[PDB]
């Protein structure tokens, strides 16, 4: 590589390296005005045609670094806006690239990007269809500055796919707001599991980390040698460090040697790999950490033979303890793609704790061989729950189950604010939907994924406006630690019911107005602040009150004069309700 700058246009094209270098800068200058950017844009690509013609040019045997830093320190408006950032520019490069990263602000005070009609955007679309697309990627990357950029490519390329397809349709409101809310869920919670790989290195150390990785990995490949899962996960571990680090440039040379590596020594890998490996540079690391489960060697052995009663146990954890925990659970992973990741290290922390007290015991042997009988119960806590409420939404549709996690969760923690409380309930049963789909055999990694980011989120809001000790206990708690804390939340004895509020429970002719989705969160947040008033009430009293509220809202959405009804009938519901509690 004569120029960094040349090679990179030519294995990524003018179309990619025109948006990649446009959601490079709506990150680091996240306040100038879109077509500020354009400019920008095309004078870096007008000069990489320059070195792509001639290596040997004037300025193309610069870095992209040195390159990037300085198109930065022309701008301007840099002093007058940025401040601090432009004291950057004063640096000599190694330096100077390192400023730019500690003056990056996750979320600045932008305000919400509004979705427009439906029409409006299909109108956008056919009349000029690149400055449509982005100016839009210009939005989305200058509010989540560390969302890796060709991971928000490559969503891009996917809503340009769903405004190919629904614009030229029967109804396109029905056909684009369900693409868009699926895309738009996966947008977050792709932003979810960068934050949260990144929060969990840093809380929880290089040590955890690993094991996760390993686990993960030995589940996905599991024809291959536990030397090999190793290499992996070093390097992986370095491919986090660096990504979080925040040097787009840096991440990216990283996940592409690891992409380079796997495809080569695919044959010792995993055979479900060939289609990724035929992609080109961009997608490969993407496509890769998609890449499906092999199946695993027909007839394996059972662990009890070299971990539970051969001799030289105790001398072969003591030689290496961690390596040795690691060659476990490498082991025990492989054999079961059922199991979420945390229920693996789990079972592997449990193993160590034993280990540690039957290695400096009396007799070794004796102390552990009944440590498989450890696991037995650790396995059916997740299982069971997984048994229990899938068979619980299958009763109730998704919005009926909804209601029942919302009453369950409000009784445990009264104290969390209503619209909190509903958001949560809702999302859960969602994850009821997609995860209920899958059979037993894919359950319990289905939940691991949507739970953990659901938790996560669930923490920060926390973190922000704190509210009970027993969420704090579960929120810094290790991660292997955090869904059983939740779980093992106990119903509110100490709480206090609120002072009845009028207003709260009346209800005006609008909410048959509505849609579906507005109703179901009107409703929800009347029956999260009727838990509030009457904690103490049963399955069967909140089945009633429940029931009065379902006909009374039939009754005035089906009779003329709605307004009258809904006063004077909801006169009666309310001290008829707060009778039988
Ligand atoms: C990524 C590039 C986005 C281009 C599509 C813009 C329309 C999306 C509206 C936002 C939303 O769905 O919440
Ligand atoms: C490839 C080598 C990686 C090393 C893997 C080590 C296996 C560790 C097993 C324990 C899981 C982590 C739980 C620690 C909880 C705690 O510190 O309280
Ligand atoms: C003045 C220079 C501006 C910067 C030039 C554009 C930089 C884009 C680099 C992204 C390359 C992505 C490499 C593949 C890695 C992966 O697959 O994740
Ligand atoms: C799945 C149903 C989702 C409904 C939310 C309430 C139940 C959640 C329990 C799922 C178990 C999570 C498994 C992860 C683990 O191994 O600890
Ligand atoms: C701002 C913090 C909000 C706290 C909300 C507390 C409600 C608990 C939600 C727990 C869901 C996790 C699944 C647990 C499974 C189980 O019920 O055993
Ligand atoms: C004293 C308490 C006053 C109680 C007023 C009645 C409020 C109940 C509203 C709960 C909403 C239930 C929705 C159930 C459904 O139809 O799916």
Same mark, same amino acid.
């Given at each position: 590589?004569?120029?960094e ?16 270098? $446009?959601?490079?800068?709506? @990150?680091?200058?996240? @306040? ?39 198109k930065?320190?022309?701008?301007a ?5 940025y ?6 520019? +004063?640096?000599q490069?190694?330096?100077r ?20 009609? &439906?029409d ?28 890796? *950029? ?7 390329k ?5 405004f ?6 029967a109804?396109?409101?029905?056909? $684009?707001l ?13 932003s ?17 980390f690993?094991?996760? +990785?390993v ?50 020594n695919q ?6 790999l ?6 080109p ?12 489960? /092999? ?17 030289? &146990? ?5 030689? +290496?303890? /961690? &390596?040795?925990?690691?060659?476990? $659970? ?15 290290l789990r ?12 290695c400096?015991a ?7 061989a ?17 048994k229990?409420?899938?068979? $619980?939404?299958?009763?109730?549709g998704?919005?009926?189950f909804?209601?029942?996690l919302? &009453?369950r969760?409000?009784?445990?923690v ?5 619209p ?9 049963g ?10 037993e ?26 509210v009970?000790?027993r ?17 093992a ?5 100490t709480?206090?019911?609120?002072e ?11 909410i048959?107005?509505?849609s ?5 969160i ?9 838990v ?17 509220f379902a ?27 707060? *009778? *039988?509690?």
């Open positions: 590589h004569k120029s700058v040349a090679h990179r246009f030519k294995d990524l094209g003018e179309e990619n390296f025109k948006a990649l270098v $446009l959601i490079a800068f709506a @990150q680091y200058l996240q @306040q100038c005005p879109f077509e500020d950017h354009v400019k920008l844009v095309n004078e870096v690509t007008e000069f990489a045609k320059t070195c792509v013609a001639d290596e040997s040019a004037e300025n193309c045997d610069k870095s992209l670094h040195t390159l990037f830093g300085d930065l320190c022309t701008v408006t840099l002093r007058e806006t401040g601090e950032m432009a004291d950057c520019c +004063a640096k490069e190694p330096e690239n390192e400023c730019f990263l500690q003056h990056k602000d996750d979320n600045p005070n932008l305000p919400r990007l509004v979705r427009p009609e &439906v409006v955007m299909c109108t956008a679309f056919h009349d000029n269809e690149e400055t449509f697309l982005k100016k839009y990627l210009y939005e989305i990357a200058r509010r989540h500055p560390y969302f890796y *950029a060709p991971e928000l490519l490559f969503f891009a996917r809503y340009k796919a769903a190919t397809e629904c614009c030229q349709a109804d396109k409101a029905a056909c $684009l369900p693409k868009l809310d699926e895309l738009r869920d996966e947008g977050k919670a792709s979810a599991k960068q934050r949260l790989k990144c929060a969990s290195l840093q809380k929880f150390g290089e040590r955890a690993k094991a996760w +990785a686990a993960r990995l030995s589940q996905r490949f599991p024809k291959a040698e536990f030397a090999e899962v190793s290499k992996l996960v070093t390097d992986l571990t370095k491919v986090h460090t660096e990504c979080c680090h925040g040097d787009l440039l840096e991440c990216a040379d990283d996940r592409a040697d690891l992409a380079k590596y796997i495809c080569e044959d010792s890998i995993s055979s479900k060939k289609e990724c490996c035929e992609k540079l961009l997608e490969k690391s993407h496509c890769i950490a998609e890449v499906e489960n /092999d199946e695993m060697p027909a007839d394996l052995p059972s662990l009890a033979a070299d971990f539970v009663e051969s001799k030289d &146990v105790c001398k072969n954890y003591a030689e +290496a303890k /961690d &390596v040795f925990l690691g060659m476990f $659970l490498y082991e025990y992973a492989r054999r079961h793609p059922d199991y979420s990741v945390v229920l693996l079972l592997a922390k449990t193993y160590e704790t034993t280990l540690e007290k039957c400096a009396a007799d070794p042997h004796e102390c552990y009944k440590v498989f009988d450890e696991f037995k119960p650790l396995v059916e806590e997740p299982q069971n729950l997984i229990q409420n899938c068979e $619980l939404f299958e009763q109730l998704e919005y009926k909804q209601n029942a919302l &009453v969760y409000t009784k445990k009264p104290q969390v604010s209503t909190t409380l509903v958001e949560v309930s809702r999302n859960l969602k994850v009821g939907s997609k995860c209920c789909k899958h059979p055999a894919k359950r319990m990694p289905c939940a691991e994924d949507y739970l953990s980011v659901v938790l996560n989120q669930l923490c920060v809001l926390h973190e922000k406006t704190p009970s000790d969420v704090t206990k579960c929120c810094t708690e290790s991660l292997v630690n955090r869904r059983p804390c939740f779980s939340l106990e119903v509110d004895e709480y206090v019911p609120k009845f509020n009028a207003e709260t429970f009346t209800f005006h002719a609008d048959c107005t509505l579906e989705k507005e109703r179901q009107k409703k929800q947040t009347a029956l999260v602040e009727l509030k008033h009457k904690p103490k009430a049963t399955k069967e009293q909140l089945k009633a009150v429940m029931d009065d006909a009374f809202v039939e009754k005035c959405c089906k009779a003329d004069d709605k307004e009258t009804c809904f006063a004077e009938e909801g006169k009666k519901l309310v001290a008829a309700s707060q *009778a *039988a509690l």
